[PDB]
Amino acid sequence: SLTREAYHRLTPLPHPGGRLFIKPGARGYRDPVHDLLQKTVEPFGERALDLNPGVGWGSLPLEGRMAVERLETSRAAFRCLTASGLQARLALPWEAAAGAYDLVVLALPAGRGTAYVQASLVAAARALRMGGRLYLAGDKNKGFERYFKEARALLGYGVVVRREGPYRVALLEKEKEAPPLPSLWRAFSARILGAEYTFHHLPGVFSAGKVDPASLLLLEALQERLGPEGVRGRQVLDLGAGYGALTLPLARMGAEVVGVEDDLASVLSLQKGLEANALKAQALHSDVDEALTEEARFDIIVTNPPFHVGGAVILDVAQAFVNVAAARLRPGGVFFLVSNPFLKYEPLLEEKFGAFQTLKVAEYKVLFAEKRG
């Protein structure tokens, strides 16, 4: 459906008094949680901090009325904030300065998992000065109640200030000293293709604590098709690199790998993973191929695209992955993609490459395609 032009296109949408840029892959718009926040938040003090900005809809009401800092981890969303002219920093929630804010706005990043959420909760508690306030928004169907009560335990006072369907916004006040940030880094050893690796990652990464079965299947298929030395000295693009499940092995195999990842936490995870294993590769914080030059081309492109649990529809970002792969590959170059059995990638590859091959069919399927000039 979406073309590369359309995926990377930044579209400004109107709202009373201004405009806000949104784009495919950027969270925040058409989101009930952020929408309820926008209708609830009001100025308090002089310094505010948004720990889950997205396109900036939730804390927009504070814009122009008090100093507002936005810590964004999504490159896609960051592009939007930048285009909208909204003060924002490429940073993790827990990188927020302690005791420097009067107000904190936080739409619960439930989709990121409990670890990421709790880290954000403590970050908010630490960022606030004693007496500071926190606007916490969420979905009761997505743990709002649990996190709200945990937030209350961390700060003290806290009550719901707005309701709409299962969506909620609570306002809490820091009455007690915040605890230290919990340990954020995790590490686990894994063997891939007969080699040992030690992966390091922060909260919220895909397949935390273990190498994903699908990722392993892709590498197995790749080695069978190209051989153990098949990627040596070759330029490889890893779409959605994560903490490096595919990136590290390929780099160790001698390839010159470029990993593009939209999530900041995942990017830092990849960087430390490479360092810890004495491997070198480009860990780019990028919305698909946004960070690349117009001329950049590759010999091999691999990917374990994002997907919705239990869904049979390919995500826009995933579709973009395929479009970019086809456009970024040099004639004769090869594309490797792994996905659950419920995603209709075949007709997509057929369209973009003209033909494809199924290398493996198990719990997951590994598809292959060669770029024709």
Ligand X SMILES: Nc1ncnc2c1ncn2[C@@H]1O[C@H](CSCC[C@H](N)C(=O)O)[C@@H](O)[C@H]1O
Binding site for guanosine: residue ranges? 212, 304, 307, 340
One-letter amino acid for residue 62 of the chain: L
Task: Give the list of residues 6+ apart from residue 157 with CB closer than 8 angstroms, or none.
Answer: 172, 173, 175
Selected from 20, 22, 23, 25, the binder of ligand X by CB under 6 A is 25
Which of 178, 261, 345, 364: binder of ligand X (CB under 6 A)? 261
- Residue 309: which residues within 8 A CB-CB, separation 6 or more? none
* Binding range to ligand X, per CB under 6 A, among 83-91, 138-146, 187-195, 242-250: 242-250
Decide: is 306 part of the binding site for ligand X (CB under 6 A): yes
Q: Which is nearer to ligand X, 79 or 126 (CB)?
A: 79
User: Using CB atoms, what's the residue nearest to ligand X?
Assistant: 240
Helix (H) / strand (E) element for 349: namely: helix 346-353
**What are the structure tokens assigned to 3, written together?**
């073309």
Rg (CA), the chain: 22
> Least distance to ligand X from the beta carbon of 207, Å?
5
Number of residues that bind ligand X (CB under 6 A): 21
Q: Is 206 in the site for ligand X (CB under 6 A)?
A: yes
CB of 265 to ligand X, least distance (A): 9
- Measured from the CB atom, is 84 or 303 closer to ligand X? 303
Q: Which of 151, 231, 241, 326 binds ligand X (CB under 6 A)?
A: 241
CA distance 312 to 274: 34
Under rule CB under 6 A, which residues in 264-303 are in contact with ligand X? Answer: 266, 287-288
Binding residue positions for S-adenosyl-L-homocysteine = 215, 261, 287-288, 304
User: Cβ closer to ligand X: 25 or 58?
Assistant: 25
Phi, psi of 199 (to 5 degrees): -85, 140
Q: Does 246 bind ligand X (CB under 6 A)?
A: yes
Please report whether residue 215 would count as binding ligand X according to CB under 6 A.
yes
212 binding ligand X? (CB under 6 A): yes
> Whole-number minimum distance, CB 23 to ligand X, in Å?
10
Residues 6+ apart with CB under 8 A from 4: 320, 323, 324, 327
Instruction: Kindly state whether residue 334 participates in binding ligand X, applying the rule CB under 6 A.
Output: no
Does residue 104 contact residue 125 with C-beta atoms inside 8 Å?
no
* Binding-site sequence positions for S-adenosyl-L-methionine: 215, 261, 287-288, 304
Rule CB under 6 A: choose which of 120, 271, 277, 304 binds ligand X. 304
Residue 38 or 266 having the CB closest to ligand X: 266
Q: Tell me phi and psi for residue 133, to 5 degrees.
A: -120, 150
Phi, psi of 191 (to 5 degrees): -110, 125
The nearer residue to ligand X, 206 or 335, going by C-beta atoms, is: 206
Q: In Å, what is the CA distance from 2 to each residue of 8, 322, 343?
A: 10, 11, 17
Separation in Å, CA 20 to CA 17, 25, 57: 10, 15, 8
Using rule CB under 6 A, residue 57 touches ligand X: no
From 12, 42, 17, 16, select the one nearest 29 (Cα to Cα). Answer: 12
245 neighbors 304 (Cβ within 8 angstroms)? yes
What minimum distance in Å lies between the beta carbon of 149 and ligand X? Answer: 29
Residue 286, token pair as written in the block = 């990028």
Detail the residues annotated as belonging to a binding site: 212, 215, 261, 287-288, 304, 307, 340
Q: Please report, as residue ranges, which positions from 72 to 101 form the binding site for ligand X (by CB under 6 A).
A: 76
Stretch that binds ligand X, among 35-43, 140-148, 238-246, 322-330 (CB under 6 A): 238-246
* Distances in whole angstroms, Cα of residue 104 to Cα of each of 39, 72, 94: 16, 14, 13
Partners of 191 in beta bridges: 196
Q: Give the span between the Cα atoms of 67 and 85, in whole angstroms.
A: 14
**List of residues contacting ligand X (CB under 6 A):** 25, 76, 206-207, 212, 215, 240-242, 245-246, 260-263, 266, 287-288, 304, 306, 317
